[PDB]
């Protein structure tokens, strides 16, 4: 034994003498673990960054649309119904506040936002538009619904916005990040670790300097190490469910709200009789495409993974003058965490 880069070992099969002790054998074992990890990391890095990219972009891309619709709706009220301000500035704000909240997962009932909107809207119409000239507010809020002053305009808006706000209310992007990030942390069996050590490092224990492991030996070893991991391939390919969803807006619906609200005109068509009774009573899509394009190029990630480890490590794919795990030969002859990834790949929710 020069520079290296009896017998009672527990990994390297000693044909005779050996250059390494039980302690250098344990060194070689931990560096195999570190090496496999780095290789898995490198395999998953480009895909991991791709989904991290788009998850950050797409998340920022809806709050802008809600702010823009709010200001447009506020401006249209200021310009066309100045007698309804500043009260309109308040119930418009109340509604679009709930819009964003509902988008981002809060417990918000859409039929409210619409109903609170029209419950807040009708008293100021009555007092300022229909019969110009505070204690009587609550009667008018109740008579709004008891007398159905807006007809089916609230229901129309309810269905218009509930359909668009439900679809907008990311899980799959973040889950892909979470499974792919799990891959570089996969713990393998102890037998796989002993075999990885024999494949990569035990040749140095026999005193060889340049000999590389046979590719065939690498595949038998890798197919044995990644036996549970390859089962994930079919669930990862079922990418396709994501491609199905991207069947796909909220801007037009929210921008169109003032027009529908203005068609107020219905109510005033009945101001005459209605007053009397109340008197008595009281590139985005382009980004989706490019993501799916790049994502399909990684559809074989879990099936190509054992070949990646073998190809991105020094091997004699020629299977000549190579290390078989215990001797230099002339020609080579012969789950929990995994199941959680399977279970999560639940998301295949993707019931377009």
């Amino acid at each position: 034994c020069h520079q290296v880069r009896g017998s009672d070992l527990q990994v390297c099969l000693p044909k005779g003498p050996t250059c390494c002790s039980r302690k250098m054998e344990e060194k070689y074992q931990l560096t195999a673990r570190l090496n496999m990890e780095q290789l898995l990391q490198s395999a998953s890095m480009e895909l991991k960054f791709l989904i991290i990219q788009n998850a950050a972009v797409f998340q920022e891309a809806f709050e802008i649309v809600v702010r823009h619709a709010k200001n447009y709706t506020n401006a249209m009220f200021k310009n066309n119904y100045p007698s309804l301000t500043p009260q309109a500035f308040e119930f418009v704000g109340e509604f679009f506040t709930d819009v964003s909240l509902y988008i981002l997962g809060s417990d918000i009932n859409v039929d409210d936002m619409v109903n609170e909107l029209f419950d807040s809207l009708f008293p100021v119409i009555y007092t300022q538009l229909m019969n110009p000239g505070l204690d009587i507010n609550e009667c008018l809020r109740g008579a709004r619904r008891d007398l159905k002053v807006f007809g089916n305009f609230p229901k129309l808006i309810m269905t218009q916005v509930s359909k668009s706000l439900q679809v907008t209310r990311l899980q799959a992007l973040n889950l892909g990040i979470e499974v792919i990030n799990t891959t570089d942390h996969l713990k393998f069996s102890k037998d796989c670790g002993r075999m990885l050590t024999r494949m990569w490092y035990c040749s140095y224990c026999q005193g060889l300097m340049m000999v590389k492991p046979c590719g065939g030996y690498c595949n038998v070893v890798m197919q044995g190490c990644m036996a549970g991991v390859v089962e994930i391939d079919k669930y990862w390919r079922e990418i396709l469910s994501l491609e199905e969803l991207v069947g796909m807006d909220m801007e037009n619906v929210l921008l169109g709200l003032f027009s529908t609200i203005h068609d107020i005109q219905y109510v005033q068509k009945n101001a005459g009789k209605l007053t009397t009774t109340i008197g008595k009573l009281c590139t985005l899509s382009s980004r989706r495409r490019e993501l799916i394009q790049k994502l399909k190029s990684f559809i074989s990630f879990y099936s190509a993974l054992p070949g990646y480890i073998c190809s991105h490590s020094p091997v004699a794919e020629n299977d000549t003058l190579c290390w078989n795990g215990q001797e230099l030969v002339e020609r080579y002859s012969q789950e929990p965490v995994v199941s959680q990834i399977i279970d999560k790949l639940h998301i295949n929710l993707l019931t377009s």
Partner: nanobody
Amino acid sequence: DVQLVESGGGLVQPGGSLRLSCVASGSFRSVFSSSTMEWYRQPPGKKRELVARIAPGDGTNYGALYADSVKGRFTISRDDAKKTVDLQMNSLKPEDTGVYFCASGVAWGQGTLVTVSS
């Protein structure tokens, strides 16, 4: 299901004519007569633009508006008994190529392709 359903799109030569028809379906049929109906065009690689609008009628007249690009060539009409809005398109030009959508303030159709080419 509530659907605005466009039809009558197709291929036509320059100077030809087409009639687009949009049918209001779903029991939207009750509000159609009180709804403004609109036709929009989306040319290839361009934004969607208003082509024609027709107001609700009082039984004697409809207020019709047209984009300047189609003025004197196109005619919007509506049949409240059938719940249809039609766009008669005459003296078609290559610039009239696009997907045509009927709309209301609450609903959009899926659109129909018009191609004006030799």
